[PDB]
DNA sequence: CCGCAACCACAGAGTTTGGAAATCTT
DNA sequence: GAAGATTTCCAAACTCTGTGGTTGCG
């Protein structure tokens, strides 16, 4: 789905919802794109950071590069981000040498994810 | 327990839910085969007109090329 | 009796068979989906090939003229 | 007080998995 | 008919959202 520039000018990645429910599947498929040239089969990993949580547990945080893209299957966020705080994840392309990219204040992980205001 | 009133009811609804799903998947599968024919028809159709535009442009080029 | 040696063997035998067969089912299911994408690929590729030649003929027509 | 944003639990619809029977096909 | 294959039935184990009870904190 629509993509966005990263901290790095060599890689683009999928846009993410502002806030989503921990351990729930995302609206789109998370994918990383390399503008330069990168060897298919290049392992790519995603970590999620935050002041509060140093690194939050994730599911399907690894993916093999293919045709300049490393599509991720049902990537998932286990750890939470803390009220009002967002996760700043770290994409890490495993080439020679390993390359790094960052998407700042990317997604928010709460136990409920977006909910409908309570009718009280 | 296996004779609870809750039991049977919960159980009997799950059953309905299952019928639903089985039906659903069985259906998607079919729609897929359909989706495959659909395209096979298109590749055949595409393939025919492709061998056409190749003969027609290879013919026009023939009068031209050899004069 | 749903618990008489004979039945029991016959039962297990069938199970052995439903397992094998469910398996085949899924496999065939995947092949299809695969086949699908594999077409869509070829289908898209052919559409170009047409475009390519359609233009190419519009050129040897506008060319025969001039 | 109230409503928002987070947590926790925890119903209830969906799904996937697997052994029985029925139904088929050979 | 007989044997194996396929399908239909369900039960059980989980997975996928939702909603309700609470709570600090504007």
UniProtKB/Swiss-Prot annotation, chain A:
<comment type="function">
    <text>Forms the heterodimeric complex core-binding factor (CBF) with CBFB. RUNX members modulate the transcription of their target genes through recognizing the core consensus binding sequence 5'-TGTGGT-3', or very rarely, 5'-TGCGGT-3', within their regulatory regions via their runt domain, while CBFB is a non-DNA-binding regulatory subunit that allosterically enhances the sequence-specific DNA-binding capacity of RUNX.</text>
</comment>
<feature type="domain" description="Runt">
    <location>
        <begin position="1"/>
        <end position="119"/>
    </location>
</feature>
<feature type="region of interest" description="Interaction with DNA">
    <location>
        <begin position="109"/>
        <end position="118"/>
    </location>
</feature>
<feature type="binding site">
    <location>
        <position position="111"/>
    </location>
    <ligand>
        <name>chloride 2</name>
    </ligand>
</feature>
<feature type="binding site">
    <location>
        <position position="80"/>
    </location>
    <ligand>
        <name>chloride 2</name>
    </ligand>
</feature>
<comment type="function">
    <text>Isoform 4 shows higher binding activities for target genes and binds TCR-beta-E2 and RAG-1 target site with threefold higher affinity than other isoforms. It is less effective in the context of neutrophil terminal differentiation.</text>
</comment>
<protein>
    <recommendedName>
        <fullName>Runt-related transcription factor 1</fullName>
    </recommendedName>
</protein>
<feature type="binding site">
    <location>
        <position position="53"/>
    </location>
    <ligand>
        <name>chloride 1</name>
    </ligand>
</feature>
<feature type="region of interest" description="Interaction with DNA">
    <location>
        <begin position="76"/>
        <end position="84"/>
    </location>
</feature>
<comment type="subunit">
    <text>Heterodimer with CBFB. RUNX1 binds DNA as a monomer and through the Runt domain. DNA-binding is increased by heterodimerization. Interacts with TLE1 and ALYREF/THOC4. Interacts with HIPK2, ELF1, ELF2 and SPI1. Interacts via its Runt domain with the ELF4 N-terminal region. Interaction with ELF2 isoform 2 (NERF-1a) may act to repress RUNX1-mediated transactivation. Interacts with KAT6A and KAT6B. Interacts with SUV39H1, leading to abrogation of transactivating and DNA-binding properties of RUNX1. Interacts with YAP1.</text>
</comment>
<feature type="binding site">
    <location>
        <position position="57"/>
    </location>
    <ligand>
        <name>chloride 1</name>
    </ligand>
</feature>
<feature type="region of interest" description="Interaction with DNA">
    <location>
        <begin position="21"/>
        <end position="25"/>
    </location>
</feature>
Swiss-Prot record, chain C:
<feature type="domain" description="bZIP">
    <location>
        <begin position="4"/>
        <end position="66"/>
    </location>
</feature>
<feature type="region of interest" description="Basic motif">
    <location>
        <begin position="8"/>
        <end position="28"/>
    </location>
</feature>
<feature type="cross-link" description="Glycyl lysine isopeptide (Lys-Gly) (interchain with G-Cter in SUMO2)">
    <location>
        <position position="65"/>
    </location>
</feature>
<comment type="function">
    <text>Important transcription factor regulating the expression of genes involved in immune and inflammatory responses. Also plays a significant role in adipogenesis, as well as in the gluconeogenic pathway, liver regeneration, and hematopoiesis. The consensus recognition site is 5'-T[TG]NNGNAA[TG]-3'. Its functional capacity is governed by protein interactions and post-translational protein modifications. During early embryogenesis, plays essential and redundant roles with CEBPA.</text>
</comment>
<comment type="similarity">
    <text>Belongs to the bZIP family. C/EBP subfamily.</text>
</comment>
<protein>
    <recommendedName>
        <fullName>CCAAT/enhancer-binding protein beta</fullName>
    </recommendedName>
</protein>
<comment type="subunit">
    <text>Binds DNA as a homodimer and as a heterodimer. Interacts with ATF4. Binds DNA as a heterodimer with ATF4. Interacts with MYB; within the complex, MYB and CEBPB bind to different promoter regions. Can form stable heterodimers with CEBPD. Can form stable heterodimers with CEBPA and CEBPE. Interacts with SIX1. Isoform 2 and isoform 3 also form heterodimers. Interacts with TRIM28 and PTGES2. Interacts with PRDM16. Interacts with CCDC85B. Forms a complex with THOC5. Interacts with ZNF638; this interaction increases transcriptional activation.</text>
</comment>
<feature type="modified residue" description="Phosphoserine; by CaMK2">
    <location>
        <position position="58"/>
    </location>
</feature>
<feature type="region of interest" description="Leucine-zipper">
    <location>
        <begin position="30"/>
        <end position="37"/>
    </location>
</feature>
<feature type="modified residue" description="Phosphoserine; by PKC/PRKCA">
    <location>
        <position position="21"/>
    </location>
</feature>
